[PDB]
Design a binder for this molecule. Structure first.
Ligand code: FAD
Ligand code: FAD
Ligand code: AUP
Ligand code: AUP
Ligand code: AU
Ligand code: AU
Ligand code: AU
Ligand code: AU
Ligand code: CL
Ligand code: CL
Ligand code: K
Ligand code: K
Lengths: 461, 461
């Protein structure tokens, strides 16, 4: 029964971040990891995804080579080549990662962890038990797959975790979901050559994002050659001779339902949401609160319903982004160990980029979210649509949409949403302005950087 | 002797902008243009330059095709193809441009204009004379070429104006200058295949920019295969059998001068600065003030040393950017016609992007400029250098540098300078923040957008 100042459950983005900051503050932390250190983030998340996104962008620009005065470019494309490099890059960083964690004198407890049936702050990792007045739950989540009970054959399809294990380009791809992980994957596969289909329960993807984004993204997916199967759900799946057959039902309002058999699918990817890893923590044994989906409940300070126990990251279910986990984990360390009874993460105005094609950028409230918080009368929105001049010479095209959500007489910028070339690297700066409480005037008093797309944001009329 | 409310001299970026805003305010404007409406901006500036920049970027990314899992791409590249399209795009916009100017009921006086020898507000355009209580000088500037007196054979070399008239890719290129127009041109030519040399009077380019940028840009030019001829000047030029021979003198401190003959140059481009078009306005005939280089002097309100006469744009010599001309021209219209005795352009924190490879972004003071304004003790700077993960799988590389200049206890962000992938579209947002008076804290309280380069700006330690 060893004892530490800080005991972290889950050695990934949030856990490590928080633990490391603690030891930096003096605390003697001990993080527990059951698998690879770095969680979803490193291994099957962010980077490997960005690399794959880059490869896809490259592929697109190459459909432009000729347009740009060059002789046509082949396009065979070898997945195994990029995969190899991706794995290299990962472990390459992963090595540096480890080095740091190592020099942070943080003990790494190996094995699955769960809270036992004791009252004093303790969890049991493979027999042995550990205690600490402060215990953090940063076990993250996982890709959600349907039960054979619900959809027979469901285990035939993979998830984003499988996506990064793929060694070849699926000839025929089917992705089920409407979130960013789904949109992102369909984007890459399609760009890289797979005959891709995206199956969504409704008529547009990213429905939680602003209406303009949802509508525009769906249209771009289509223009890019991604078959968007609207108002469709997978009723059953099974292995055929040439791969997989997917039976889906399409229920378009104003139309009668219809069954369709999708044949020769080289692989199905489930991208229907993430599930928090809490089912084996045996939380109840301490009364740690959770919602019905399993997320650990917390207050503005990442405090669980039980003293001396906290939670940050995907496990909490709000804002599933590695930076949010990082920030939350650190602020906590500062509160618990630097004694800053105010150290806490502001979840408002967290900027997000969805790596679609072109990328999506967003921060602040959606128009609809604004209307509810301020009132229809107190909300004006500006927006523009245009074709990046990069496509001025291209047969192939993609537009750019921008929307600015303003509130009150002062027209405070409470929301910024956009999709288009560059937007992935264009948002960070504006997010900063938005968190300072920028106004439409603040944007308009800023001289435009011509010629770029970014300048359109400070010239919205 | 017709009379108008607003008479504009020069129908380009600033003139048109200002005039158009005036008529929008009621004023009956009449702009005078001696050549093509749109000035340097449209015809031989911004867009045609960006197009050419894009083509070059494309060319670079194509040196990566194989790295990114694709079979090698040829690379012949046909300049005439892009040129044709560029010309198309230009006139295509140029058409829209005209449409607007037309529906703005602004009379366009054709012909060269200059102030006569009268006291009442009047200029003479091809015989006829025109008057107005408010007259704007927006004649812009022009590329500077040396005299045969100074450098014999100088007329053999072209300027940026010639660059956009080129129908082929010069096999061997030599560009003289250290400014952005010089750096930009060398970048494109080199990227597109020309064996390029950049001749600079000193050891680095963009010496007016921050030290980090100057140093980094020069190194990138070199890595990209651009021969940077340091401490060299063109002493003489002449046409040989295989093109042109350039005689230059290299004067490296700590070393003895040396003459070098550069042979087989397919074309020399002078990019040594811009000259304001005022020498034929016969300004003196009214006592309109100018500096020794010819720029028209003005106050914070674009007022010349003579009532009823103003000037905005390159002709004034400060901040030679189409947006600055636009902004200045409009604010003036608002002052003179909306009667806003405060309507004036803030020249502080004007953001600028230099389209090098990778692009350069900047706003605010340079570290050295900060030290002088606040004092060494009151200035701390943050900076980071790294390789965009886009190059994680590329043999070819380019780094990314970022520098944040802070002043006082509060660490107010007074300067932001960077070079790297995306920076061209990454700056606008941060400029906005910077003009609001952002602090290092304002940046740091903003959640990072991972994984991007932009996030490095809000995580500088
Ligand atoms: C395909 C994909 C792409 C993504 N792209 C992005 C992106 O571009 N930008 C972005 O910001 N976010 C992205 N994310 C999300 C980001 O990776 C996560 O938000 C972040 O990793 C969550 O942090 P976490 O601390 O919860 O860690 P993980 O979710 O990183 O959790 C940490 C560790 O907990 C361990 N663990 C679980 N249970 C136990 C236990 N009982 N005992 C011990 N250890 C345990 C796990 O094994 C894991 O290694 C992406 C995710 C996916 C799946
Ligand atoms: C290669 C190159 C690239 C550039 N790239 C960029 C860039 O990326 N971003 C940026 O912001 N800026 C860029 N610029 C600069 C930008 O184009 C200028 O700052 C802007 O055009 C200046 O505005 P202006 O109003 O002075 O017009 P011009 O300088 O546009 O002036 C307007 C007109 O005055 C007319 N005129 C002159 N004398 C007379 C007379 N006596 N009577 C009547 N008419 C007269 C001219 O014929 C001209 O058409 C670039 C310039 C060059 C050369
Ligand atoms: C070649 C290409 C894809 C597979 P994918 C794959 C999977 C994907 C990534 C990592 C691990 N497993 C998996 C399956 C695949 C599938 C797709 C069509 C027909 C049969 N199987 C089926 C069961 C779950 C794992 C197998 C061989
Ligand atoms: C093919 C390629 C370049 C020229 P460039 C060119 C020029 C460039 C653009 C537009 C107009 N003129 C010009 C010259 C050129 C030059 C370069 C090397 C040897 C001789 N001439 C020489 C005089 C000024 C105009 C002529 C033929
Ligand atoms: Au991550
Ligand atoms: Au598969
Ligand atoms: Au321009
Ligand atoms: Au030439
Ligand atoms: Cl590991
Ligand atoms: Cl014209
Ligand atoms: K990480
Ligand atoms: K223009």
């Amino acid at each position: 029964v060893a004892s530490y100042d800080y005991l972290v459950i889950g050695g990934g983005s949030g856990g490590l971040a928080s633990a490391r900051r603690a030891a930096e503050l003096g605390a003697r932390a001990a993080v527990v990891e059951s698998h690879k250190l770095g969680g979803t983030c490193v291994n099957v998340g962010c980077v490997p995804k960005k690399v794959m996104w880059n490869t896809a962008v490259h592929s697109e620009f190459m459909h432009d080579h000729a347009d740009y005065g060059f002789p046509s470019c082949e396009g065979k494309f070898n997945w195994r080549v990029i995969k190899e490099k991706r794995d290299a890059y990962v472990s390459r960083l992963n090595a540096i990662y480890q080095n740091n964690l190592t020099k942070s004198h943080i003990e790494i407890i190996r094995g699955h962890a769960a809270f036992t049936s004791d009252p004093k702050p303790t969890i049991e990792v493979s027999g042995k038990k550990y205690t600490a007045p402060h215990i953090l739950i940063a076990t993250g989540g996982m890709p959600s797959t349907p039960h054979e009970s619900q959809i027979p054959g469901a285990s035939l399809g993979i998830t984003s975790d499988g996506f990064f294990q793929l060694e070849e380009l699926p000839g025929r791809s089917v992705i089920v979901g409407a979130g960013y992980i789904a949109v992102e994957m369909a984007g890459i596969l399609s760009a890289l050559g797979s005959k891709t289909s995206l199956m969504i329960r409704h008529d547009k993807v990213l429905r939680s994002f602003d209406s303009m984004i949802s509508t525009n993204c769906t249209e771009e997916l289509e223009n890019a050659g991604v078959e968007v199967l609207k108002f469709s759900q997978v009723k059953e799946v099974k292995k055929t001779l040439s791969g997989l057959e997917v039976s889906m039902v399409t229920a378009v309002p104003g139309r009668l339902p219809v069954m369709t058999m999708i044949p020769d699918v080289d692989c199905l990817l489930w991208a229907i949401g993430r599930v928090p890893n809490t089912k084996d923590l045996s939380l109840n044994k301490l009364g740690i609160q959770t919602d019905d989906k399993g997320h650990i409940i917390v207050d503005e300070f990442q405090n669980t319903n039980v003293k001396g126990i906290y939670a940050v990251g995907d496990v909490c279910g709000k804002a599933l982004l590695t930076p949010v986990a990082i920030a939350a984990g650190r602020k906590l360390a500062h509160r618990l160990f630097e004694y800053k009874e105010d150290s806490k993460l502001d979840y408002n105005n967290i900027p997000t980029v969805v790596f679609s094609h072109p990328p999506i950028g967003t921060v602040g409230l959606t128009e609809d979210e604004a209307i509810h918080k301020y009132g229809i009368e107190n909300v004006k929105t500006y927006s523009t649509s245009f074709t990046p001049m990069y496509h001025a010479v291209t047969k192939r095209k993609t537009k750019c949409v921008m929307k600015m959500v303003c509130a009150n007489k002062e027209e405070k910028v409470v929301g910024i949403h956009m999709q288009g070339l560059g937007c992935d690297e264009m948002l960070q700066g504006f997010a900063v302005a938005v968190k300072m409480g920028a106004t439409k005037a603040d944007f308009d008093n800023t001289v435009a950087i011509h010629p770029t797309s970014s300048e359109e944001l400070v010239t919205l009329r």
